[PDB]
């Protein structure tokens, strides 16, 4: 930002103001300077800026310019009154890299001080693909994208990339930080078994004849690819009927008595015992 500097001859008070600020106490405008400095942001400050501006103005009359030794250079009697917006400072920067694995929740948090309140936060994501640019993370599905803390639930291999947060104050001054997310990926273990639940399946001819009941299948270990399920062996058609869609078996009773359904993914099998009551 550009800071305007006003100087009062009679009180030796130098007032720092926003570019649009002004005074009506007899102070005269002596110049403006960039804070933070564009080329040396962390090597100089407002004191150095004010000293440099004052060095080029007459001590006899600050309105006019002058050269040494007829300029204002004795800073010991100069009081700097700060009335401009405080500098925007990134208190807690993000971790340059975060490493995790699939299925883990990841949280980013940033703390920012200074600036003109209220502050606004906007997160962005850039994929690792070639030519991918930063894109805003929609705050609709993920409300946390509007706040200083961003939470991404159950990250995946597609979540890997660079995450950036842009913080803007009331005056439009922006400060941002970025982090690279690395998601460890491993081969899914081969299916060692299929689990059916519930098993046994209890049916009533009186209650379940229309809609039947469902059995769900899962793979062991957890996170293994169950594959496409099919019925290898139908139940006794005099006792029950069975249909499979995705990972759900629907079984309908026909008459009282026990039967079984064998479900397979082509490599593993699971038997569902079906107990039919009247």
């Amino acid at each position: 930002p550009v800071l305007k500097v006003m100087f009062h001859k009679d009180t030796n008070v130098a007032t720092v103001l926003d570019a649009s600020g002004s005074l009506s106490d007899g102070s005269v405008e002596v110049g403006t300077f960039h804070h933070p400095d564009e080329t040396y942001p962390d090597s100089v400050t407002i004191y150095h800026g004010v000293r440099d501006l004052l060095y080029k103005r007459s001590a006899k009359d600050p309105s006019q310019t002058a050269s040494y030794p007829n300029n204002i250079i004795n800073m010991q009697v100069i009081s700097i009154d700060m009335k401009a917006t405080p500098r925007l400072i990134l208190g807690t920067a993000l971790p340059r890299v975060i490493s995790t694995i699939e299925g883990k929740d990841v949280t980013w948090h940033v703390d920012v001080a200074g600036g003109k309140a209220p502050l606004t936060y906007k997160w962005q994501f850039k994929a690792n693909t070639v030519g991918a640019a930063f894109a805003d993370i929609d705050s609709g599905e993920n409300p946390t994208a509007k706040t200083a803390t961003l939470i991404n639930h159950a990250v995946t291999a597609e979540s890997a990339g660079t995450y950036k947060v842009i913080v803007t104050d009331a005056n439009g001054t922006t400060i941002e930080s970025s982090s690279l997310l690395v998601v460890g990926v491993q081969e899914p273990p081969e299916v060692a078994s299929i689990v059916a639940y519930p098993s046994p399946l209890a049916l009533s001819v009186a209650d379940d004849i229309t809609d039947g009941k469902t059995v769900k299948f899962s793979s062991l270990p957890a996170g293994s690819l169950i594959g496409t399920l099919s019925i290898k062996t139908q139940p006794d058609s005099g006792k029950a009927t069975a249909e499979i869609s995705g990972n759900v078996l629907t079984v309908k009773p026909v008459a009282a008595g026990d039967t079984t359904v064998v479900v397979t993914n082509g490599t593993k099998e699971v038997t569902v015992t079906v107990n039919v009551t009247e």
Binding site: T39, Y40, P41, D42, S43
Partner: protein, 51 residues
């Protein structure tokens, strides 16, 4: 003013031009950080029968 600035943050020193940079922007601590071997509790419990 000749300023060191902050070369590690992309802020070059005044002495370095477009085709120059600091040769040594950090000091390398050559002693690395390592983790110890995990403990074993069941291996000592095993008796040995020669095959």
């Amino acid at each position: 003013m000749l300023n060191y600035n902050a070369p590690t943050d992309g802020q070059k020193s005044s002495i370095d031009g477009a085709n120059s940079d600091q040769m040594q922007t950090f000091f390398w601590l050559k002693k690395a950080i390592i983790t110890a071997r995990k403990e074993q509790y069941f291996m000592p419990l095993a008796s040995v029968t020669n095959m």
